[PDB]
Paper text:
We next synthesized an HR2 peptide containing the MPER sequence, termed IPB19, and its structural property in the presence or absence of an HR1-derived target mimic peptide (N52) was characterized by CD specroscopy. To understand the mechanism of the IPB19-based new inhibitors, we sought to determine the crystal structure of IPB19 complexed with N52. The crystals belonged to the space group of H32, contained one pair of the N52/IPB19 peptides per asymmetric unit, and diffracted X-ray to a resolution limit of 1.24Å. We could build most of the residues of the peptides in the electron density map, but it was disappointed that the C-terminal MPER amino acids of IPB19 could not be located in the electron density map, reflecting flexibility of this region. Nonetheless, the overall core structure as a classical 6-HB conformation still revealed the critical interactions between IPB19 and N52. Owing to high resolution, we were able to observe extensive nonpolar and polar interactions between those peptides. As shown in Figure 8(A,B), three N52 helices formed an interior, trimeric coiled coil with three hydrophobic grooves and three IPB19 helices packed into each of the grooves in an antiparallel orientation, in which a cluster of hydrophobic residues (V1176, V1177, I1179, I1183, L1186, V1189, A1190, L1193, and I1198) of IPB19 make hydrophobic contacts with the N52 surface. In addition, we identified twelve hydrogen bonds stabilizing the 6-HB.
Residue numbers in the entry:
A (entry chain B), B (entry chain B), C (entry chain B): 1175 to 1201
D (entry chain A), E (entry chain A), F (entry chain A): 908 to 957
Amino acid sequence: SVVNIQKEIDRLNEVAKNLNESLIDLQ
Amino acid sequence: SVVNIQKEIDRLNEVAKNLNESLIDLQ
Amino acid sequence: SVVNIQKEIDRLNEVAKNLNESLIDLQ
Amino acid sequence: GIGVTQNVLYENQKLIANQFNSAIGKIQDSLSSTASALGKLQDVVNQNAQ
Amino acid sequence: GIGVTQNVLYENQKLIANQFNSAIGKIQDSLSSTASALGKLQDVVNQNAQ
Amino acid sequence: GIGVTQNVLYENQKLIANQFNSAIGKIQDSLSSTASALGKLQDVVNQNAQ
């Protein structure tokens, strides 16, 4: 049997990037 | 051999839910 | 085939520990 | 004067809270995705072992 | 008056810090659980390959 | 007096923001590591199935 977890992987990489938008701007 | 990681999975789903209690209430 | 994900595991355990340094000191 | 400064501090607090809540929501999604992927792997590893 | 407003802002900061620290603790637990699950999977995948 | 208290509150906000940003950076790294490990597992599980 094969496993398909690509949607989960894609989402983790997406959040790893878009957490940049949650950073607090010191300036 | 079989793998048993159900306790870890349960804990991840538990924290995914109970992080609701860590949210800051704007009101 | 074998899998090698030890560097990822090491990093997760490292961050689990060094997040202590990101805590806000109430005192 | 002081009321302007009070409001600057209050607006900062609202920004901190909104950014924090946004991050927590994204982290919650990530934890559900991690759990989902791990359960799928557990199932297939065990199916192939059997 | 201003001292009431100062205290409102300070209590908000204590709330922000306590909620943040609570979330970090839960996230730390989640990272340890993720690492634990991944190591168990690595071990069994490699055992079955061998 | 009030300006001292205003500055105490402002320094607290800068601390909260810096600690939060630090934690988010570490969590981002952790999510990339999790995704990386999961993709490696998916690949090898499927290779051994085939």
